[PDB]
Amino acid sequence: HNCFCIQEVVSGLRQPVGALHSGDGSQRLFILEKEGYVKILTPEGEIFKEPYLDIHKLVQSGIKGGDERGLLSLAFHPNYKKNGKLYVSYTTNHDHILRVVEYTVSRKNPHQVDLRTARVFLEVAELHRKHLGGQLLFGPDGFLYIILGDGMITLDDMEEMDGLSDFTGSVLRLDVDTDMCNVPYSIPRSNPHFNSTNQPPEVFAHGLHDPGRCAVDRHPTDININLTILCSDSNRSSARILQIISLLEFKPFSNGPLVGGFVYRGCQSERLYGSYVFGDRNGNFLTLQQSPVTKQWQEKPLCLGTSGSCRGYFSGHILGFGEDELGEVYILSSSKSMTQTHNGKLYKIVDPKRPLMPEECRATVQPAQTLTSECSRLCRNGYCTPTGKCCCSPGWEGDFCRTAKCEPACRHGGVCVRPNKCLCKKGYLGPQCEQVDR
Ligand SMILES: [Cl-]
Ligand code: NA
Ligand code: NA
């Protein structure tokens, strides 16, 4: 009598890999498709016909099972409501490269990102097509964590090939909130290699092999602990943890290989609040609890059962998980039958013991607005940083890169119209208007 149940929410996805919201109040859910798409699902349950992001041309997907290449992850800037910034990680065309790129939603349309605004941050080289990782997330510190798998690169493979990474197998951590204009991302002071020119400054921890989706506790009440990141891993199946006030390798699981996990922070289940949930491909879930007393970890199983329309099974295999803005969680699934007809699916987890909309859970949809920041309206000739800093293209300047540069200057009422281009009035001639007619 303690089971949870599963509700189908949408079908007809193409090989979904996960889903998340954008923290802008709009209760939109962004569904990632592996071939390279992000679709929008409204709180009313419509899927928009135009992708929010369509980069299937840049991304090298993959056909075989086990071929982990495609769109990997998506993270929205913590202040996206204002700056319209998002970060994606995909694999593109030494087998391939794993980019991590910043994009900016379009200025004219809240529901489509401006493909022109790409702004690459990392490019990690890859020899194989497994153990990639790619999970992006923002901690409450405001920094950008990137969990990378070892790419199954050996120490052999690393010493006899220059142009590898030192990044693979690691949790990197960046400060995207830079005012600098010459390097894409700053580096946190707290980093365990700030300025150190031996081990790479981005790295914040390492030794991950084949991580799944990693649970992320943001400790809203817990004032002592800042962020905990808990990862399933194979190579057989084990956990790895990270707490912030360099990672520890236990094994609380006693069965097969997990897809990943999540920390439930929703409102609809009371019983489940704060729990760490992990699941496998076939939908056997478990919870993890730390003993306050001994700090040891225990798996309790968590079961599914039918309760009305809300079933105790779902079809296909789990590929990923999803969390909406209200904190409710989803399963993304597909099969070999499912994937051939684009019938991947989004299911919601429900606590049948509680109402679907308890008084405490109501919330008012705040419809996504056109980008409004100062930097967005004015910075034409360059690019904005997340902080509002306009970073001029080459040959421009001024606060918002509005005024053009000419070395040398324009003369006889000339006018520096675009970089090294003078408008001469009628009658002076030349590159800089320096010669007079006749
Ligand atoms: Cl907490
Ligand atoms: Na949203
Ligand atoms: Na805190």
Swiss-Prot record:
Domain EGF-like: 374-401, 402-434
Cysteines engaged in disulfide bonds, as pairs: C3-C303, C5-C310, C181-C391, C214-C231, C267-C361, C375-C384, C379-C390, C392-C401, C406-C416, C410-C422, C424-C433
Ligand binding (Zn(2+)): D162
Entry keywords, A to Z: Cell membrane, Cytoplasm, Disulfide bond, EGF-like domain, Glycoprotein, Membrane, Metal-binding, Repeat, Secreted, Signal, Zinc
Annotated tissue distribution: Widely expressed in fetal and adult tissues. Highest expression in adult heart, liver and pancreas, and in fetal kidney.
Protein's GO biological process: dorsal/ventral pattern formation; epithelial tube branching involved in lung morphogenesis; negative regulation of signal transduction; negative regulation of smoothened signaling pathway; neuroblast proliferation; regulation of fibroblast growth factor receptor signaling pathway; signal transduction; skeletal system morphogenesis
Membrane topology: Peripheral membrane protein
Subcellular location, principal: membrane
Glycosylation sites: N195, N226
Any GO molecular function: zinc ion binding
Ranges that cross the membrane: none
Gene Ontology CC annotation, any one: cytoplasm
Localization per Swiss-Prot or TrEMBL: Cell membrane; Secreted
Interaction with SHH zinc binding site: region residues: 155-167
Assembly notes: Interacts with all three hedgehog family members, SHH, IHH and DHH.
Family per record: Belongs to the HHIP family.
Role this protein plays: Modulates hedgehog signaling in several cell types including brain and lung through direct interaction with members of the hedgehog family.
Comment block on domains: A flexible loop interacts with the SHH zinc binding site and contributes to zinc binding.
Protein name, UniProt field: Hedgehog-interacting protein
Organism: Homo sapiens (Human)
Gene assigned in the entry: HHIP
Shown chain mapped onto the complete sequence: 214 to 671 of 700
